[PDB]
Design a protein around this ligand. Sequence first.
Ligand SMILES: OC[C@H]1O[C@@](CO)(O[C@H]2O[C@H](CO)[C@@H](O)[C@H](O)[C@H]2O)[C@@H](O)[C@@H]1O
Ligand SMILES: OC[C@H]1O[C@@](CO)(O[C@H]2O[C@H](CO)[C@@H](O)[C@H](O)[C@H]2O)[C@@H](O)[C@@H]1O
Ligand code: MG
Length: 580
Amino acid sequence: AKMAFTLADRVTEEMLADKAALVVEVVEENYHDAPIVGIAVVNEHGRFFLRPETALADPQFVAWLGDETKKKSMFDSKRAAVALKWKGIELCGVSFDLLLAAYLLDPAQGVDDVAAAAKMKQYEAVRPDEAVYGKGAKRAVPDEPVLAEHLVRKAAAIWELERPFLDELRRNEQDRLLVELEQPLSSILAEMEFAGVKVDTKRLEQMGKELAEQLGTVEQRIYELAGQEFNINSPKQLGVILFEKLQLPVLKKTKTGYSTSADVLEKLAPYHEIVENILHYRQLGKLQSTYIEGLLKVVRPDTKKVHTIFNQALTQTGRLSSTEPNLQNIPIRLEEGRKIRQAFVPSESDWLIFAADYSQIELRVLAHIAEDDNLMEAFRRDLDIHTKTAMDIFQVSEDEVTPNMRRQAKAVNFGIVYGISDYGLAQNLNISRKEAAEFIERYFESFPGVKRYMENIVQEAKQKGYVTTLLHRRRYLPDITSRNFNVRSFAERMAMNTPIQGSAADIIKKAMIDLNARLKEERLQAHLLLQVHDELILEAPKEEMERLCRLVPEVMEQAVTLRVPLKVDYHYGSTWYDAK
DNA sequence: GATCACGCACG
DNA sequence: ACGTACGTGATCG
Ligand SMILES: OC[C@H]1O[C@@](CO)(O[C@H]2O[C@H](CO)[C@@H](O)[C@H](O)[C@H]2O)[C@@H](O)[C@@H]1O
Ligand SMILES: OC[C@H]1O[C@@](CO)(O[C@H]2O[C@H](CO)[C@@H](O)[C@H](O)[C@H]2O)[C@@H](O)[C@@H]1O
Ligand SMILES: [Mg+2]
């Protein structure tokens, strides 16, 4: 059963052909400044394993890596590219990435190794990485014989699988999505991750000290009000204090006991002074544990930068996610948490942070796809969309829209984008299912094109088996035919939501590609640092701000052409906090 | 130790 | 609600 290959002691010319499957193996999950443990090459001339110390010190091999005209097929080329950037080596000419190809074909498969991608096409002559390396405490790089055969079998699988994957992408009309959107984006994300974001660790440490003082104060107040010390971060110990010792009403249970979620606590606050203190404690504790201590653990002590990893092949809608650290959920909604952003600073002297965000991209995308006359007109007038929605559903003039009305119309707009249901809206607004249904009925009377879209997309999902986004991303929805109401309804909400969230994802990905090309043409030093779903965050010399104020919004607004305008707001300042 | 349950940060 | 990451404490095994 063994797979033949040359365990090479030196790089030869036949290893440097102009098309190859290439494996540059990085086993550590976080590949930043991580070891490359081995290299495999499969091409017309055979199969090869190279020790990294050998290949990466060889000038011909390094030149071949960096030659755009020598084409490589890979799995997770970003991982390799970034590990190589940390070694000062450029990887070019990646023409096929099996991880991104598998992801586009079916995001639900959760493909995260070559074996899983291969199994999609009945190819099983390669082991799962977890089988080779083990998992958790028992994870380890095996001896050279085992390692080499594994890397060669992965390269061989990539070599074999490129054509059937490209053929299927082409049938799905996704070949341009791979080659013109996701692959070029992978290189851009590699640059962003490698650059990292500078952190003002002294400021974080000072915030930490202040938080600890406040946590101490509130913690003691809680014990005082409870008449007893207990573990406040234990929903089970906390439940006993609240619902047994203090006799608060049980408005909601969980699988294993009493609910103490913030929405339940907010309702209990009027009964006892301890409740507001628990909420405050939770707010502070979240900032302290997750943000202060968490960021300080992953900042690089030499450069004081954090280097996130954007998972490009995870979400079911086509969004990125971000890990270790997650830089897409830094606090902003509450002022106390928002100050954490004062610790994210430019990487060079006399540079600034510049942030640009789409205004209501999801609702604008919905206006476009539904071709709803009223909603399109609203965005063509650049109206406040929540005030307009309130005017329509409550049948009042602009003058007559009260703050509570705008708040409830806003909630309907979110429900509409998420996939509307009377239960979901009733829970959000703390009203009855009947009252929620009335709001939804009035919404659909005012936006009949949106109503027709929502009916039609559920039917299309049933008929075709999947739904698609503007640039032809797809998501299969087999549960749409379930005879279980809850299972089927969740799938219907995915059918409604995915073309909106996913098309917004497509647009900003295209904007990033367009933006980097414009930045290069203009030879600006500005560069991307982060993407947070509908916003791009850059840093640049202060002398580039005026040019960015015109360039970045224009590129983001013109990335696609819709039946309504796209609108982009922007701000800049000395820290991420100030870019407001 | 690993995994689950719960809670909560973001768009 | 739709889409994510992850920290703490409880429980599985
Ligand atoms: O390199 C990112 C790429 O690798 C995968 C596995 O193929 O995820 C791995 O790397 C992530 C980043 O460090 C980890 O969060 C992770 O758990 C690990 O499996 C892909 O999912 C991802 O696209
Ligand atoms: O009454 C139709 C209305 O119900 C929805 C669910 O909100 O779809 C249901 O009705 C269908 C056919 O008309 C089925 O295909 C279906 O699976 C069922 O859930 C709406 O989509 C539809 O407009
Ligand atoms: Mg915005």
